[PDB]
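Researcher: Last one for today. Full complex below.
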Amino acid sequence: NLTTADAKKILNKFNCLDIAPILKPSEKESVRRALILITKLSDYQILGICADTADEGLLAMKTYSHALGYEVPDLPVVEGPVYIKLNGKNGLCYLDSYAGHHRGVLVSCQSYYEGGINEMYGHLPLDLFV
Ligand SMILES: [Cl-]
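Model: Here's the assembly. Have a good evening.
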């Protein structure tokens, strides 16, 4: 069973990583469990997804949002690398053309109340929940 401090330690391994690593199967399981625990200790999450193609990005969006318990929409696509935002507080969701060099998912966990998590983690793997 995973403690909050353990979960944070796991996620903090990705602190300031611009490009998410390719993780082994059991590493992914640990990161999944850590992320799910931590997000229960926050009121909502905002996702920022950078991917080489719309398809990879949209797959990340659909799989993360499901594991986090969020409903999602169809976003129109663009050619080339993409950035996708999914705002869990106000429902904002969009896909843009992305000219940057990061890859993976940033998960901003926000809480209205002190004691709650107010941290951003990643970049975490696009395929973390695949
Ligand atoms: Cl970070």
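The domain at 1-130 is CATH 3.30.360.10 (Dihydrodipicolinate Reductase; domain 2). Residues 16 and 60 are 20 Å apart (CA to CA).
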